[PDB]
Design a protein around this ligand. Structure first.
Ligand code: 7PH
Lengths: 51, 431
């Protein structure tokens, strides 16, 4: 029923290793390129009401 | 022309211009706005305006003496201008103003009136002068938590806490012997000034200004002062430039000169030899810009400030400007370098050799405070002639190509995008 079984499991090993490494690398790059926006700060002194 | 210099603890440096009709004589201290903690900030501005106070200016104007002052990041100055026959009167007045006494300038009424006036001037600067407050916030965020970030003008929250004790404490720690250079420019001789200083005593103090614990370090950041009730969008943007006493000083200035300055309403300004204008004039992206190469004692800034009303196309302005900046690293031509040489010779000779003696006094005082002697203009022109295209490409690869930037903006800057697209536009991805 499953003549592909051997090659299916070794290609599964390759694919799971490469995609786990890509997933962790992409988590790093998302935390990297969002670092300017996570740490952004806002202060607010309310303006002069005469205008 | 010639610049001489002598020493006795004070430093006496002159420029005898015998063709001029006035003579500026004044002391240029080596402290500035970069030597204040953020709680006594604006004390140099307040010394500027008690020196230019009404009673002091009246006593000056009785003898025909006009006062002048300047507060920079590195250097203060206190210049007294007069006719060329009254250099002794100017020296004796400067002696009586600073050295002989300070309590009559620092009376209660004079100090309170001057504090009121400078508080008015700082508030008027804060809510009405927009490109200069953009440049001050650009310094305040490029060099943050570091003494070169402090504005020369002072802040409203600090300046209303100063009393006379802080003025006297700054005077005792910074108005010193080795910290100062007494400068005479205009129509005076050097020997006359030295013999007249030695005729008096004119000893400011013992010496040794406090040493800053932290050196200036550039820090890529941004600050956005968004005010939707303003008609324009003012924005400065700069990288870490070259300080003075650097071998890349004139190269940084010539790189600023390549892209020059621009005013969209002047007809002769729209016809300049800049390749940025072909991109910028089609849809009228800005009203004006200027490229600046600011150089301080510890660090510097290189970038451009601009203003625009086309508030929906600010990102296109930043985009084409930064692609032109990326042309410096890769493919800047020979003709652009020759044009920037000629224009920088022109504006540098206008700056150092204008007719106004107080500006010569400020520049000579700053230069002989920092680097011990004034580089005359002929050697400056030889150093400008020595620059090649490879020097500009090496400098741009060192300082421009994919380096952190500092951004400050106010007005209708919603069209200005995030930090990351402006940062990522510093490298082209095509080279
Ligand atoms: C065209 C859309 C196809 C998207 C497939 C995504 C589903 C994940 C399972 C993929 C398994 C099929 C490939 C395979 O068996 O390779 C196996 C290796 O595993 C992988 O490398 C898959 C990594 C997937 C990365 C996706 C990159 C994005 C490419 C976009 C298209 C240009 C077999 O390798 P091999 O034949 O030995 O060279």
């Amino acid at each position: 029923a499953e003549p592909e079984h051997d090659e299916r499991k070794r290609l599964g090993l390759k694919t799971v290793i490469i995609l786990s490494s890509l997933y962790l690398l992409s988590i790093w790059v998302k935390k990297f390129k969002w670092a300017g926006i996570k740490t952004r700060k806002f202060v607010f002194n309310p303006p002069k009401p005469r205008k | 022309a010639e610049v001489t210099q002598l020493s006795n603890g004070i430093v006496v440096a002159t420029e005898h211009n015998p063709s001029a009709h006035t003579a500026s004589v004044g002391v240029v201290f080596g402290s500035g706005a970069a030597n204040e903690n953020p709680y006594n900030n604006g004390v140099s501005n307040l010394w500027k305006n008690i020196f230019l106070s009404k009673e002091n200016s009246a006593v000056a104007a009785k003898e025909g003496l006009a006062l002048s002052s300047n507060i920079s990041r590195d250097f203060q100055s206190y210049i007294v201008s007069s006719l060329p026959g009254s250099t002794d009167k100017s020296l004796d007045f400067l002696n009586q103003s600073f050295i002989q006494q300070k309590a009559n300038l620092l009376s209660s009424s004079n100090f309170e009136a001057t504090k009121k006036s400078v508080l008015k001037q700082v508030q008027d600067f804060e809510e009405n002068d927009h490109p200069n407050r953009v440049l001050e916030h650009l310094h305040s965020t490029a060099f943050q938590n570091t003494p070169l970030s402090l504005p020369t003008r002072g802040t409203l929250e600090s300046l209303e806490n100063l009393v006379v004790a802080d003025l006297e404490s700054f005077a005792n720690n910074h108005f010193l012997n080795s910290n100062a250079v007494v400068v005479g420019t205009g129509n005076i001789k050097h020997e006359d000034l030295v013999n007249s200083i030695e005729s008096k005593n004119l000893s400011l103090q013992t010496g040794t200004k406090p040493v800053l614990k932290k050196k200036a370090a550039f820090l890529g950041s941004e600050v956005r002062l968004r005010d939707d009730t303003l008609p324009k969008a003012w924005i400065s943007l700069a990288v870490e430039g070259e300080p003075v006493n650097s071998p890349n000083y004139f190269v940084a200035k010539l790189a600023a000169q390549i892209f020059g300055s621009y005013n969209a309403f002047e007809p002769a300004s729209r016809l300049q030899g800049i390749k940025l204008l072909d991109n910028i004039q089609e849809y009228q992206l800005c009203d004006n810009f200027n490229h600046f190469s600011l150089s301080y004692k510890d660090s510097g800034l290189w970038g451009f400030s601009t203003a625009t009303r086309n508030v929906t196309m600010i990102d296109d302005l930043i985009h084409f400007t930064l692609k032109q900046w990326n042309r410096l690293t890769i493919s800047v031509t020979d003709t652009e370098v020759e044009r920037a040489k000629s224009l920088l010779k022109l504006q540098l000779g206008q700056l150092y050799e204008s007719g106004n003696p107080v500006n010569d006094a400020n520049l000579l005082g700053a230069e002989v405070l920092i680097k011990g002697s004034k580089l005359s203009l002929g050697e400056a022109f030889k150093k400008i002639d020595a620059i090649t295209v490879k020097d500009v490409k090496a400098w741009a690869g060192k300082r421009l190509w994919d380096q952190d930037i500092a951004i400050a903006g106010t007005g209708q800057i919603e069209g200005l995008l995030d930090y990351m697209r402006i940062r990522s536009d510093m490298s082209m991805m095509r080279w």
